[PDB]
Each structure stands twice: as C-alpha cells, then as structure tokens.
Amino acid sequence: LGGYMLGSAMSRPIIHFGSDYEDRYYRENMHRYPNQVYYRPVDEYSNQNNFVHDCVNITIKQHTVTTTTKGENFTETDVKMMERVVEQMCITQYERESQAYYQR
C-alpha cells in the first residue's frame, strides 16, 4: 500500500444480497469480516469505480494475504460476502469527501 489512507471503523453493516439464506448466513458469520478499508486521497490519482476496485481489492487481498498467517481459510463465498461489505463501506467513505470535491 505504502501511501494509502484508512477510514474510521463502523459496526459491521448488513448487506441485503438478495436471498434469505445469505441474509441469515451473514449475521451467523459476520464476526469474521473486516470493518475498515484502505484507499488513497483524491488529488493526483482520483477516479470513481477504479478507486473502489483499488480499495476493495487492496483490502480483500490484505485479508486473503493475512489468512495464511492467521490460520484462517476464507471460503470463496466468504470472500464474495466480504467484497460487498468492503464495497459499500468504501463507497460510504467516498461519498463523504466526493461531496467535498465536486462541491468545492
């Protein structure tokens, strides 16, 4: 990362994927997932969705790196759930400054 920023914590939001199985499974298994994300400031490199990818990947793969050192093995489904959580949290932390970027 070397020069990213980090956001505040939030208590793990629910992400209504579109099925009752997943909506439950999440609350059964929410206590494993990340609750913060990593992204740069907007001054040189600024983007919309590219910046969500370079947030989400860099956070997700930070877990999928650490998993090997944590003696964990996030399932492909766990990674898929984490992706969504990381997206909405990163988009949240985008809006807060994007409204202070496109309104300056």
Give the domain extent around 56.
Answer: 1-104
Task: Find the helix packing angle between 20-28 and 76-98, rounded to 10°.
Answer: 90
Contact predicate 18/71, CB 8 Å: no
The residue among 99, 103, 84, 97 whose CA lies nearest residue 37 is 84
Structural contact between residues 58 and 1, judged by C-beta atoms closer than 8 angstroms? yes
Domain CATH number, residue 87:
1.10.790.10
Residue 2 has a CB neighbour count (10 Å cut-off) of 3
| Type of residue at 75 | T
What are all long-range contacts of 28-32, with beta carbons under 8 Å and residues at least 24 apart?
29/78, 29/81, 32/72, 32/74, 32/78
Which residue shows structure tokens 């309104």?
103
- Which tokens in the block code for residue 73? 């093995």
In single-letter form, the type of residue at position 30 comes to M
H runs (alpha helix) in 10-75: 20-28, 49-70
> Terminal CA-to-CA distance of the chain, rounded, Å?
28
Cα Rg, the chain, nearest whole Å: 15
Residue in 21, 91, 27, 34 with CA at minimum distance from that of residue 64: 34
Provide the domain count of the chain. 1
